[PDB]
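Structural prep section.
Before we set up the soaks we want a predicted structure of the protein with adenosine-5'-triphosphate in place, mainly to decide which crystallisation condition to try first. Input record follows.
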Amino acid sequence: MKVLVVGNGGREHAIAWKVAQSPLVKELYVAKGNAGIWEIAKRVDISPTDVEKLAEFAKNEGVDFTIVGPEAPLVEGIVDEFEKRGLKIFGPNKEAAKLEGSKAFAKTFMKKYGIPTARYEVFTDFEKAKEYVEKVGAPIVVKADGLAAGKGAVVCETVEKAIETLDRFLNKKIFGKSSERVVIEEFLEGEEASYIVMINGDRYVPLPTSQDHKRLLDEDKGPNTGGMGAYSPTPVINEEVEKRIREEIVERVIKGLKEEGIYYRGFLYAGLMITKEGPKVLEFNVRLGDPEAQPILMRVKNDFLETLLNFYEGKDVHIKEDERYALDVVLASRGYPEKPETGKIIHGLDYLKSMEDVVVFHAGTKKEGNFTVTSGGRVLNVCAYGKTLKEAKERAYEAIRYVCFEGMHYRKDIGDKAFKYLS
Ligand SMILES: Nc1ncnc2c1ncn2[C@@H]1O[C@H](COP(=O)(O)OP(=O)(O)OP(=O)(O)O)[C@@H](O)[C@H]1O
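Run finished without errors. Recording the tokens verbatim:
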């Protein structure tokens, strides 16, 4: 069968990599993808957000199954475009994608269905929002309503930073309609963690747990980014935390969707903050997280293509998790998360291909002749398996010693928050 993966980053390389292990796929396509994915998939020169054009391609090319990686295409209704042409695609339709597409929608939904989350208030008026934050004081979190390419959610340590943020969002409208409405919520403290499940109507199946590191620099400093590294599983989500997540979050989302009459099929990644009060939703992501997908998929033993195909049509499935830990360190471009420098030659990729228990997922890489060059903010995902987390971390960092590109930056503390939970 023909399978199409939509997206150009590390999450998509992980997806394609897993799909390519299945005896079912005969032709694998990626739109657009990157240098790393092109070693195992045919390049489709269509941007992931050109949803109508992608649907037309899949139809004409006869794609049997499509898996969507990033949020933009989903929020834009790529699934609806595919359904319109009678195509099978894994991901939520435009209405269901609102759980990620609109913070206001998500927060209102969670309040209505009793889902644990940060207390909040919604605003469309700068003066009103300003007066509000001055009254509540800091720390506080200010978020744009719609997608803002990783710049919509800002933690403000001071009231001044909050008003400055509101100014850019509401007065300047830096993100257009996306920033014309904002959500201001309480700053939550605790340990961050990621819980991802696959949902199809009333049924859901959990995927490996994980913990990401959002800040650019070691000891959680510097600006927020799309994610600088993640590992699986994370002890932050023990047996009982997982029980609370499934019952107070996942199952309540399912109940809410049912009451709203909204059909949901696809991945649901809940960005969490595990507080002393219990797990709370920072935000919903209607797709796999990046880089969370990398270590997660590294630990899914079974044929993931078969699993997705069966789950897609309502068949029961059972995820078999690798007993080994999986850790991923992101190598980013100088400038990231602000304008990244690009066009730098990446050396050492061949060395890593021969390293055992090492896996590299490309993110933002392209070709320049026979050379592989940087083309985006996040460039490489240097991953490694390990019987223990310590082993996984050390192997990943050992691998980093052999890869290189000008201006490369990466955190050295990926996974450090987990050790206080282990022995
Ligand atoms: N209520 C909160 N309390 C504490 N930290 C928060 C809160 N909300 C968000 N954060 C921090 O911001 C991060 C989210 O960054 P993220 O970019 O994923 O926001 P987003 O919802 O995806 O919208 P955008 O991508 O445009 O910024 C969280 O992982 C967390 O570290």
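Observations: Residues 2-93 form a domain with the Rossmann fold fold (CATH 3.40.50.20).
Flagged for discussion at group meeting.
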